[model samples]
Each structure stands twice: as structure tokens, then as C-alpha cells.
Target: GASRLYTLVLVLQPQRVLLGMKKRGFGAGRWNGFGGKVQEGETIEDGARRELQEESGLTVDALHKVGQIVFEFVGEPELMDVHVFCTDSIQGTPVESDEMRPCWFQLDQIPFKDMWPDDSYWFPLLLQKKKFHGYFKFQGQDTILDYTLREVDTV
Candidate 1:
């Protein structure tokens, strides 16, 4: 099966992180970083920046690559290779887009219960400013069958 490349960007601040409530399509209704499929002509980092601006009206000058993850779903043919980025730097206020509603959550108040099941496992790594990688197998959207995660020196 062919693998698919996707991007997920987190807007980190001293005390909070920005999360958007996906309004429609895949992962809709769940709070998540802003991103989607990478386009053919764009670099992955550029795609991440574009997705962030498109989904939440925010822009980051530099997106630090902090982690990567591969997601496998039962009965699905395409493996999702997600490039994750984070930065304390950003410009413009986050405004709602048709695809997402942006909001800031305190570090301790991150709504993990309302996010992808995989988030709880990897989020702490990002918060600690550690580079990491992970792989997750899911029975469905909400259940993880198995997963492997580790802190890495390079993402």
C-alpha cells in the first residue's frame, strides 16, 4: 500500500497551546493541530505552514520539527505518515475558518479526552521539547490496538 504524507502543527506559547476544533471531514469535532494532505508542488514544511494559516489564520516563521508518527487503521490501505511541528513563535491572531475553530488551552487543561486517542501518548514529549517518533495501530478512530513511542535525538 502507498503511504500518505500529512502535516500537523502545534502553536505553543509559554503557558498554552493552540488547538483547533475540526469542524468537518476527517477528525471533525475533535480538537487538533492544524494540517492536512501535502500538495505536490509544496515542501512538507511549507504545507504545514499553509495548513495552519488556512485552518486557523495563524502563521509561524519557523516550525521546529519535533516529532513524526505513522498511523495504521485496520482495513485501510494507506498508511498515514504525519510530520509534526511546534513553535512558540507565531503571527496574527487565530481566527475561525470554515474547517476549524481555534482556541487556546492551558498546558494542564489540554482536552485530551476530546482529541485523537494517540495524542495522550505523544503530547508530553512535545511539551518537554523533546524530539520523538511513534507508530500507532488503531481498531477505529477512537481505539488504539497497539503503539510504540520513543524520544529521539532527531525527529
Candidate 2:
């Protein structure tokens, strides 16, 4: 197996960020950024926008790649290569979709407990607008066996 490319986009405002509750599938029941696997022939950024619009009913022209991460699971041979993006320039109000229920959360009120464990380690860096990267090896969905995270001037 090899690494599979994915995207995660955070839509931000001055004091709030938009997140979606996964209604089903891999991350069901968790509140997270809107994204999914990149399709063939689509640039990573193009996939980001497509996933964002599909999941949250919002679109943005400018997307900044703030971070990237590679996740590995204990019994899995494939790695998830996730490109993280953030953008404040958005259009259209967020509307709920079958796959995700969109919601706005205050900066001080991010729902970390209901998100992936890795989010806690990188969300702060993302909120601060820093370019960073990390690798997380997980024993299971809820436990990170080991990890490394660092900030960089460019992603």
C-alpha cells in the first residue's frame, strides 16, 4: 500500500470557525473541518474546495495551506497524506448536507473532545496561522502511539 492524498479545509472568521459534524462514514459523530480524499486529476487545492462545498455548502477562492500531516495506523499499511488549509475569504452561508451538519464555533469554544486526537496537537498552530507539519502513529482511532510536530516558515 502507499500514501493516499486528502484535504482538510478550515473556514475562518474574525472570532469563529466553521466546522461540520460528520453524519456518517470514517469520522461520523465528530466535529471537524470539511474535506475528503482528492480525486484523480484534481489538484489538492481543487479537491479541498470541492470537498468544502460538498460538505458545508460554502466556497472560497483563496485557500492557504497552513499545515500537512501524515497519519499511520497500527495494522494499516497505507498512510494518509493530509494537506490542511485555512481561508477567511468565503462565499455563501454554510448549509447542512447529508454528509455533514455545518456549524459555527467560537474560537474559544472549539469542540476538541469530539474531534480526532491529532487535532488537539495541531489546531492551535492552525489558529495562530503558522505553517507546520507532523506525523502521528496511532494504535487505534483514539490513541496516538507516537507523534512529532513542528512549525516551519513555509509549508
Candidate 3:
């Protein structure tokens, strides 16, 4: 199926991590990963890296394409393509950019109230070094469909 591509970037720090506050549109004021659409001629990894730096002023040293997600809207044939990346290493301090306001949150103190519910489900797996693949369908902030922790064997 034809998909609209996006990325999910996990930026890690020793004591805290960054989350962005969406300033406009549908998810305004919510905390989420830094990412956007994949541009023509850009690799998914490149797009992820670029978006991370552009949105949060942080440079990721390592990014492993861990999985993908497809969100289907009922009665609509299109699926939102989400590429997920996990990285425990990055360069530079998180800063506010035009697209996002970066804030640091302790790993044990993540502000779950400001983030999408699904994040609480899968984000922990990525932090634990467990590579995963999964899909989620959402009606705005709520998940209407879900498949979590599908193992993938890669060579």
C-alpha cells in the first residue's frame, strides 16, 4: 500500500531525555518524538537524523531502523507510514527550534500526561535495547488498533 512516510526518533541522555512540545496544529501542546515526512531523495535514516537535528538541535551518532508502523483510518485506503529509530547516543544539548520546544525529562520521570498513550507502551522496549517492530492505528490520541513487540530477524 502507498504510505505517507514519517520517523520516530528516540534521543537518549544519561540522566534525562528530550521531548518536544508541539506548538501548532492537531497535537498542539503535546509531547512527542521529533520527526516529519521523508522527503524525496532522502533515506529514512537520513530523514530521521536530519529531522532530529533540525527540530531539536541534537545530532544522533547512531540510529538503527528498528521498525515501522501503519495507521489505517477506517474507510480511507491510505496508511500513515511511521519509521521508528532507536538511539542511545547523540551529540549536543537539546534546544528549542522553530518546530519544537525541547525539554529534558528524567527516564523515570517522563511526563506521561503530556504524551500520547501509545508511547508508554512501546518506548520502554526501545530503551531496554530490545529491537522491535509493530503497528498502531489511532483515532487522534487513542489507539483503535495495535500490534506490539513483533520480533524481526535481520542479518
Candidate 4:
């Protein structure tokens, strides 16, 4: 099986969190966290750091590994094993790159409809600071065929 590995990191603040609207390539037009494929020889956390910095130009601090997600699609050949990370602090401003347009949203105003449907399911756990693991089977971009999600004590 040729499963692709991805890294996803979100920055959480007291009343809001940072999300990026992907500007190009896969998952474009969606509001989501900053992350990309895991590079060879890179630890997942290091990969998260790299992707976050690359996409948003914000270096992270106190990064915590919060979750993991196994994502698959009915007609897709490859799966996505996404490592989810979160941080509360960053250095430098969020500078948009060609890949993403960064934005912050209040907790009550998260644009779930503009993100992967599966995100709405597990994202609450992240906001609550509860660890989690999720498995999702999607029929397509906006439809989820089946899903399994749970709170975890650790990642």
C-alpha cells in the first residue's frame, strides 16, 4: 500500500486559533491547519515544524503532538496518515506564502463548512485540549462514508 504521510499543526490561542486557507495544490480552497508531507529522515514533529514555518512563516513553540488521523477515500489509491500537532506560541508574524493564506478564527466562528467534513468531528477535541485518534473513510471531498473517532489520553 502506498500511503502518504502528512503533518498538520494548529496554533491555539485563548479565544481563537490560526488556520490557513490553502492557496494552491491539494486541499486548496479549504480553511485548515498548516502542514504538508513528511520528508525523509524527518521526525514527525520536525516535519510539523518545517511545514508550519514554510507555510505560515511562523516558528512554533511548545508544540504538542495531539492526535493522529488515518484518512482514506473510496476511489483513491493512496491513504493519508496525518500527524496532528498543536502549539500555543509562535515567533514572527504569519506571512502568507503561495501555499496558504493564514487567518485566525474565534472558537465560536470556526469555518467548518469550508474545511474537510471530517475536521468538524475531531476538531472539537483539539479545542478542548483532549487528545484523539481518528479514522475516516470519505467517498469524496465533502462526503464521509464512515468514521471512527475517540478521545485519547495521549497521542
lDDT of 1 at 45: 95
What lDDT tens digits, residue by residue, belong to model 4 across residues 1-155?
Answer: 67999998989989999998888887889998888899999998899999888778898666998999999998889999999998998877898777788898999999999998898899889989899999999887888889999998978
Error of 4 at 77 (Å): 2.0
Candidate lDDT scores, in order, read 0.91, 0.90, 0.75, 0.89
Per-residue error (Å), model 4, residue 23: 2.4
Which runs in model 2 stand beyond 4 Å of their true positions? none
> Any runs in candidate 3 off by more than 4 Å, and if so which?
75-77, 143-148
How far residue 109's Cα lies from its native spot in candidate 4, in Å, is 0.6
Shift of residue 71 alpha carbon in model 1, Å: 0.3
Q: What would the per-residue lDDT of candidate 3 be over residues 18-130, giving only the tens digit for each residue?
A: 78898886467888887888999999999999988887888866888766766665556677788888676877678875667878789999987788766776677666656
- Of 1 and 2, the candidate ahead on TM-score is 1
Q: Say which prediction, candidate 2 or candidate 4, comes out ahead on TM-score.
A: 2
lDDT (tens digit, per residue) of candidate 1 on 1-155: 67999999999888999998888888898998888999999999999999888888887778888999999998999999999989888877999878788899999999999999999999999999999999999998988999999999988
lDDT (tens digit, per residue) of candidate 2 on 1-155: 59999999999778999888989887889998888899999999999999888878887869989999999998998999999999998977999877788889999999999999999999899888989999999987899999999999988
Candidate 4 error regions (>4 Å): none
The stretch of ten residues in a row with the least summed lDDT in candidate 1 is 52-61
